[PDB]
Amino acid sequence: TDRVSVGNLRIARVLYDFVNNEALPGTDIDPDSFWAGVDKVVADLTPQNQALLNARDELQAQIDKWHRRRVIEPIDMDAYRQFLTEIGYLLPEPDDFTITTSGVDAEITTTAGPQLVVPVLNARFALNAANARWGSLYDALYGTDVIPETDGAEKGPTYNKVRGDKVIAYARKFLDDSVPLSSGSFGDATGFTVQDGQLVVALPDKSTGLANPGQFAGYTGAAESPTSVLLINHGLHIEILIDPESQVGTTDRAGVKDVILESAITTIMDFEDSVAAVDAADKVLGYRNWLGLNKGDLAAAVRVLNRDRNYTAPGGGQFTLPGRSLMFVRNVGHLMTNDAIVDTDGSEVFEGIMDALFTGLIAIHGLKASDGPLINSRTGSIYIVKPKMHGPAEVAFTCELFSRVEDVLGLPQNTMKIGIMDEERRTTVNLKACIKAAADRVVFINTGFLDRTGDEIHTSMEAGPMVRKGTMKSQPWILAYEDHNVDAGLAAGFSGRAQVGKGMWTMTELMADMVETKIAQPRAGASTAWVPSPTAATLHALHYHQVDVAAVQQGLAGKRRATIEQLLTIPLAKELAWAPDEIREEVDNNCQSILGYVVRWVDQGVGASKVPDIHDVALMEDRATLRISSQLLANWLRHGVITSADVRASLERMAPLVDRQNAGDVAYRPMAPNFDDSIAFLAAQELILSGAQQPNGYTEPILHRRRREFKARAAE
Ligand SMILES: O=C(O)/C(O)=C/C(=O)c1c[nH]c2ccccc12
Ligand SMILES: O=C(O)/C(O)=C/C(=O)c1c[nH]c2ccccc12
Ligand SMILES: [Mg+2]
Ligand SMILES: [Mg+2]
Ligand SMILES: [Mg+2]
Ligand SMILES: [Mg+2]
């Protein structure tokens, strides 16, 4: 075969060559030392990794049996909690402590703003994401439904000046709200000059300054005639571009062309739930993009990474603001193996261990000058998001895994920082202990609420039928879970030190709703929350201007707003909650969601994209939504809500629907009418019917297997 032998390992040639020829040069790490380190880290940590997974199996088995020796319905909370305690699921809270993480960048410790997540396998999206640090507010307002397409203000093939005027007025009002004038309104401004180092705004009757002069951050061009004016509010920059000779500028009363918002302050380059990668060839594509990102030289077809932005300080001197979001990388979690490396017995190597070694190695390039200044962390950290951990022993393992990798890479200890996803129940209920296990590495906690819902369903699979998917977002457990996350963070001293993050808005086209509703996240003390696109980053940024996150977090200090009983309130459906037609649309909804996502995953290897749902609402969802949908259907089938023919009929009904929605594509092979000849259709069916039997309801084992099958089939 085509592998390279290194001690006990057999490494796929593509990955071996990539590491040697692309990743290693420039690092000063000796190739022989690196590979021997890989072999030794893998040898030392593999049995512990496996034991952690066995522990999940043991715990879930005990829970399944507890429910199966079932009473007559309502759960006895005191008994249940005592049970969780006795089996080591629910562990004691450690005493109060404060995190000690150092060498973290201001983007994480201090700045509250949007956090963008993007599939690393897509080079052009990853590039747009890195550049999303700065975004046009005019484009984001004009191009979405935040400005209502009413009579007269609708989007056409050419610019609609009536709609344009609304965009302008929306932005003026934002300016008045965020950086107030001493008197008057930006709506009445006729010009901007800089005089003796202070901003002067001409009104039609007089001139005025900012109510708070300190919000004047800089400018470009001559002071007497600046091309732009830079402001700051709540640590976020706003830049008024001034150009009377432009399409929009000629219409504006002050010659204003656009308002640019500092938007995606950080971006997560994703190797996990938003990509499909099932072998070395797939991993390498991802590693190569992550490499191009850190070196500054990634470029896509049809392009490049933005340079830093130049300004003149009011006081007088040239300075620079970052032109890119600070980049995290999301590694895969502890579950999966990947044949990119096998051992001598032919066993696949743990993929999470590989990601640490390789994304860790590659990240070193972002700590040094690109060939321009260094791309990423100026304070010397590597930021890794670690998803899907179950409890504090699993966090401690990641800690030791990073420590060992730091040794192999010749990096100082604690260089590799951890963004902890709070997205599994055993982590939620032991959160304080989970943070403590990462006390000198943690840079965020985040409520990954979609995965969290999946785990909620799987954990209590045998308890009874669960409420519908759309109901989950408002169940007591999840609300308690959101508050409990913030409390634990603030109490560990995250304020000023680490991000307290919240979850993804998935409805990419429903931007007016996002602007209206996602404001609840910073209001809840979240210093960050996830957005699916640069456009969504720009709009979510509005929320950080209206909400003083720092102040909100100070007010929340010391409070305990969720009990363990609330956390443990299983989302069981009640007596006769649904009519026949309600059950049927919930089934169709889920079968459509599964099919539309799985067909692109297995056939084209796309792990995330805009997928229209049943009512054609565009959704940017990923593997976690699949986890929920398959687990819910498995749960309804398990408890007799629906029959196996119900499931079949719905799959078979929804399948041509999906073929139609994707009739546009060219690599698309239709599932109907020969369903059993469709590897994707079979994968979809398997995720439901075998769903209850997947470890913690995870979808990767079925998905990886079927994608690999498809790839193999398309080669004979
Ligand atoms: O009485 C109780 O409340 C309680 O929980 C009893 C026990 O767990 C055990 C008693 N003998 C044992 C041997 C092995 C493992 C557990 C036990
Ligand atoms: O809630 C979770 O468990 C979680 O981790 C969220 C996600 O991964 C994403 C949800 N929609 C997305 C679109 C693009 C990239 C990532 C995502
Ligand atoms: Mg006992
Ligand atoms: Mg997740
Ligand atoms: Mg319901
Ligand atoms: Mg199981």
Tokens of 256: 């204003």
Task: Say how far apart CA 326 and CA 310 lie, in whole Å.
Answer: 18
- Say if residues 246 and 596 touch (Cβ distance below 8 Å): no
Of the CATH numbers 3.40.605.10, 3.30.420.40, 3.20.20.360, 3.30.450.20, which one belongs to the domain with range 1-133+263-573? 3.20.20.360
Coil, strand or helix at 393: helix
The Å distance, Cα 308 to ligand 4 centre, comes to: 32
Q: What sign for the dihedral angle of Cα 493, 496, 497, 498?
A: positive
Supply the DSSP string of 477-546, one letter for each residue.
Answer: HHHHHHHHHHHHHHHTT-TTTSEEEE-----TT-HHHHHHHTTHHHHTT-SEEEESSHHHHHHHHHHHHH
Which of these, 258, 268, 265, 194, lies nearest to 235 by C-alpha position? 265
Query: What DSSP assignment string belongs to 651-711?
Result: HHHHHHHHHHHTTT-SS----SS-GGG-HHHHHHHHHHHTGGGSGGG-SHHHHHHHHHHHH
SS3 string, 544-601, reads: HHHCCHHHHHHHHCCCCCCCHHHHCCCCECCCCCCCHHHHHHHHHHHHHHHHHHHHHH
Long-range CB pairs of 321-325 (<8 Å, 24+ gap) are 321/237, 322/107, 322/133, 323/131, 323/133, 323/134, 324/130, 324/131, 324/133, 324/375, 325/107, 325/116, 325/129, 325/130, 325/132, 325/133, 325/264, 325/265, 325/266, 325/267
CA 626 to CA 639: how far, in whole Å? 20
Round to whole Å and give the CA distance between 88 and 66: 14
Cα distances (Å, whole numbers) of residue 483 to 28, 299, 340, 477, 519: 45, 41, 40, 10, 15
As a whole number of Å, the CA-based R_g of the chain is 26
Candidate of 118, 504, 593 to mutate for ligand 2, largest count of ligand atoms within 8 Å of Cβ? 504
Counting from 1 in the atom list of ligand 2, the atom nearest the Cα of 117 is: 15
Do 1-133+263-573 and 574-716 show the same overall fold?
no
DSSP states of 419-459 as a string?
A: EEEE-SHHHHTTHHHHHHTTTTTEEEEEE-HHHHHHHHHHH
Resolution (angstroms) equals 2.2
Domain ranges of the chain: 1-133+263-573, 134-262, 574-716
By what method was this entry solved? X-ray
| Nearest ligand (C-alpha, residue 82) | 3
Query: Rounded to a whole number, what is the distance in angstroms from the first to the last CA of the chain?
Result: 18
Residue 248 DSSP class:
T
The two structure tokens encoding residue 357:
């070694």
Strand-by-strand arrangement of the 207-208 sheet? 191-195, 198-202, 207-208
Q: State which ligand 2 atom lies nearest to the alpha carbon of 447.
A: 1
In this structure, which amino acid lies at residue 23?
A
Q: Any catalytic annotation for residue 483? A: no
Which atom of ligand 2 is least distant from the CA of 506? Answer: 11
Instruction: State the ligand closest to the CA atom of 578.
Output: 5
**Atom 2 in ligand 2: residue holding the nearest Cα:** 448
State the Cα–Cα distance between residues 684 and 167, nearest whole angstrom.
Answer: 44
Q: Which positions ≥6 away from 278 have C-beta within 8 Å? A: 338, 605, 703, 704, 707, 708, 711
Spatial distance between the Cα atoms of 287 and 293, rounded to a whole number of angstroms:
10
Residue 451 appears among annotated catalytic residues: no
Under 8 Å CB-to-CB from 632, ≥6 apart: which residues?
Answer: 457, 466, 468, 469, 590
Name the CATH superfamily for 574-716: Malate synthase, domain III (1.20.1220.12)
- Those residues whose beta carbon sits under 5 angstroms from the ion ligand 4 are 423, 448, 451, 624
Tokens of 48: 């512990």
Angle at 349 between CA 345 and CA 352, to 5 degrees: 165
* Ligand 2 site residues, Cβ closer than 6 angstroms: 117, 270, 273-274, 423, 448-451, 503-504, 506, 532, 608, 620-622, 624
